[PDB]
């Protein structure tokens, strides 16, 4: 029977290769999205593995539009109503597959970047993604899902020049607010925090902080408030780091860069809360600020 699976993955890859010639193609892609969570006994395991390969690594770049949209619609049905999510194991497996799919699809970075950009608003897709993952819970598989999402965010920040969003700064700001809740088995927990730090660092790169639109006291007051919140959280993290030594050293090294970016963006609303640790007791903080 393994021969049958051999030609089956062969034809699946062939079709994924020549979809660029091109509708029946949409039906083909919907069958793939159905077969990602194909949980049939004795084959489905390797089936989904092969799927995770093929559409991961060999999908035609001009077929890049349709896939994104279809996934969006699927996770649009993941939310039961009004931002609330419904948790099923099938949805969980969908999420776990989907993360690796965009990870590989982004990281290949072959020719044909234009076919990636002109159509893709992956903004809402990731927003729904992190909103489902945040409510997953706290356990081993959940931690693994969370950290994989963190590398995905790191990658798609690394490729920010190619892609396109409707509102980039608002999207990144919402991503920062969602991610920094995750900062604080333990070995994993520390790994989650470790990956989340370069995720937040990549997000903060040149980000003017935008307050969430309420009525607000004013723009400047709420910008100061967000600056104070993020700065205090980072200082608490670095104080815990100040006391596996290589892990803590890397954690310090990236938290330093987080301070550097977050101060370099909002200098106006930002010196006034952190010019008073130029006299700080710990010389590590003082040195760090002292080149920032």
């Amino acid at each position: 029977d393994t021969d049958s699976l051999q030609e089956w993955i062969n034809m699946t890859g062939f079709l994924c290769a020549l979809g660029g010639v091109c509708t029946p193609v949409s039906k083909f892609m919907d069958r793939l999205l159905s077969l990602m969570v194909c949980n049939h006994e004795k084959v489905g395991l390797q089936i989904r593995t092969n799927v995770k390969d093929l559409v991961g690594l060999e999908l035609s770049p001009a077929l890049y539009p349709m896939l994104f949209n279809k996934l969006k619609n699927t996770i649009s049905k993941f939310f039961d109503s009004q931002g609330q999510v419904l948790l099923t194991d099938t949805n969980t497996q969908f999420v776990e597959q989907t993360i690796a799919i965009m990870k590989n699809l982004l990281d290949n970075h072959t020719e044909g970047s234009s076919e990636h950009l002109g159509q893709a608003s992956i903004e809402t897709m990731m927003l729904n993604l992190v909103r489902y993952v945040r409510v997953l819970g706290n356990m081993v598989h959940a931690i693994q899902i969370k950290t994989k999402l963190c590398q995905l965010v790191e990658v798609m920040m690394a490729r920010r020049d190619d892609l396109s969003f409707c509102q980039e700064m608002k999207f990144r700001n919402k991503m920062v607010e969602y991610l920094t809740d995750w900062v604080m088995v333990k070995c994993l927990t520390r790994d989650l925090d470790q990956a989340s730090m370069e995720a937040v660092v990549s997000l903060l790169a040149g980000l003017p902080l935008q307050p969430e639109e309420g009525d607000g006291v004013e723009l400047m007051e709420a910008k100061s408030q967000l600056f104070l919140k993020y700065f205090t959280l980072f200082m608490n993290l670095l104080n815990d780091c100040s006391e596996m030594s290589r892990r803590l050293a890397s954690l310090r090294h990236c938290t330093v860069l987080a301070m550097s970016n977050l101060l370099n963006a909002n200098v106006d609303s930002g010196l006034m809360h952190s010019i008073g640790l130029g006299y700080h007791k710990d010389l590590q903080t003082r040195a760090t600020f002292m080149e920032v």
Binding site: E221, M272, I275, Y279, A287
Partner: protein, 527 residues
Amino acid sequence: RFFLDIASDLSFISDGNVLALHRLLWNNQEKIGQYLSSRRPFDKMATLLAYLGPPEHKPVADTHWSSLNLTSSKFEEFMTRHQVHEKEEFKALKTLSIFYQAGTSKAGNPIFYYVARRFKTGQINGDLLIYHVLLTLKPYYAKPYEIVVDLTHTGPSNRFKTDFLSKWFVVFPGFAYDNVSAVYIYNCNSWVREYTKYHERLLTGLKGSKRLVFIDCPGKLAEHIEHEQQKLPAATLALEEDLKVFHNALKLAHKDTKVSIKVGSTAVQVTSAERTKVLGQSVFLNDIYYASEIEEICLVDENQFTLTIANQGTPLTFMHQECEAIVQSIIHIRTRWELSQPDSIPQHTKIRPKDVPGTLLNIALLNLGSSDPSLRSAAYNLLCALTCTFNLKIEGQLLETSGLCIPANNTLFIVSISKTLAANEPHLTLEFLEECISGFSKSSIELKHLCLEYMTPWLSNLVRFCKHNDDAKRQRVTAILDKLITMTINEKQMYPSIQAKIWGSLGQITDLLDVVLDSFIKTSATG
């Protein structure tokens, strides 16, 4: 022969030296005019001086192109030359969402939506606003276009200054004004009416203008712009929805007027039911009061009450048969906002690096003598950077490198640096000395002696900032002496060294003595 041997054979100065030169020019303007007459030079200087103003009298956060020439061609070349396109504040103002192009009218004119309430009174806000308007409007003012002025919730915080209001009528080309097909003015209020009453003279071109279409009912906007082409802000639309309407309302004022009160979950909208004159046209005004602005809620009687709004001299007196229902409707949502809102937070002064050169010199020089060599390297990097960017004259004694190994006993280097800065740059002594005194109390013992040792060259500069024309500066001098008294009393340790350095150098300078002794007399009497 020795004299024969010696006799035969790109840099921008700091802000303070230019400021001193500017003082010397301005205080003697008329006389240098007379002597230069004894012709283009005096003139160039003359306009230049005016553009600057008389000597410093304003926060440098505030700077404005004045109107002595005020030509559009110049303004555009000035903005393009310095690449204002690239600055982050312009992208920030784009994020503020003011004057965004949206939609195309029934006459085929593209429409620009100016939101007045999102603007706060301020200088860079205003000038970036007018340049943003010129840049966004630039593709389209060669052709007919239409604008919508959203005047929801506009108060004195959103006003244009008179000089700034005069700028809008001169910087744009004439056919930019002429291509304006229609101006839809939406939700005009009584404050805007007052503002026009103070400003009929500059708005005389709009006085009686038929291009001013006042959208006194929201459906009237559908008569000129399609609803799908309507892209007004979401909060503006939410101001119209789910409004609890009470007709037959009266405002009791100097003039009692007929109004109607629509109470929504965030605000109260009082809409005038009788037309009043703004810009030569009779309109229906509507004053908007957010729930965050309501000051006091009370019921004088069922037929009449007074409502107090923040920053008002008198509460507005409202007379209606249903005043009690209005009071409960307002007070329920107001109290649930009161529960919903967070507490008060104290806020600090906005700090930007180009107006704090003293504190950064203190954080540099103090840490330059610390124990940890990495900290000394970082301190060397800041000292080089400050002497570079702020253009202080150091006579080329600093250079940045990686791998420099700094000795722990470098105090002579620090003192040489501080003495050279006190010689070549006296304009920041007050903030520098104050921050040094402040950092004294939070420093270690060897660092405390270091702090004494590099602050003592600066004390001879206090003669310049004493007896000055500005009394606030000599007040600052006396305050500094007060903290010096305080630290001398509190620190019983280092007391011989404190007397040997601080008061020892202070007593050596005649004509500074008298304020010092007078401070001694007043502070000895205390206690």
